[PDB]
Design a protein around this ligand. Structure first.
Ligand SMILES: [O-][Cl+3]([O-])([O-])[O-]
Ligand SMILES: [Cl-]
Ligand SMILES: [K+]
Length: 131
């Protein structure tokens, strides 16, 4: 069937949203275009890159972006990863569905927290695929 589009939006496009994009392309790649953005943009967190590298997923080529309206309007599903993203997300046109999957912000925390959030996001995406 026609490939769908999922857009992960978080406070920034530095950690949670980048790991979601990484997992999304790996798990949902066959039937989904996967993108990510932040309400704010502050570079990709090197620890998020390393966290994904540890599970053989390369996100070193990702970029930190604000929301692209063109992609947004053509998205089938928008997933917010933080309450700030949930609240600051633009009013979505009727053709776009929206869900909130919250995760803790690993910024400034110890290494194991990046691993923890990485794997919680992995689980959420694996469950999503089973719908
Ligand atoms: O994607 Cl976040 O940078 O909000 O973690
Ligand atoms: Cl799929
Ligand atoms: K991005």
């Amino acid at each position: 069937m026609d490939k769908k589009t999922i857009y992960f939006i978080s406070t920034g496009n530095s950690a949670r949203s980048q790991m979601a994009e990484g997992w999304g392309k790996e798990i949902l790649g066959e039937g989904w275009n996967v993108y990510s953005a932040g309400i704010e943009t502050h570079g990709v967190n090197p620890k998020a890159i390393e966290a994904m590298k540890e599970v053989d997923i390369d996100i070193s080529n990702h970029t930190s972006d604000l929301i692209d309206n063109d992609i947004l309007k053509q998205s089938d599903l928008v997933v917010t990863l933080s309450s700030d993203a949930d609240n600051n997300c633009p009013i979505l046109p009727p053709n776009v569905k929206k869900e909130h999957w919250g995760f803790d912000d690993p910024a400034g925390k110890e290494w194991s927290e990046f691993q923890r959030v990485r794997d919680e996001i992995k689980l959420a995406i694996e469950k999503f695929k089973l719908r």
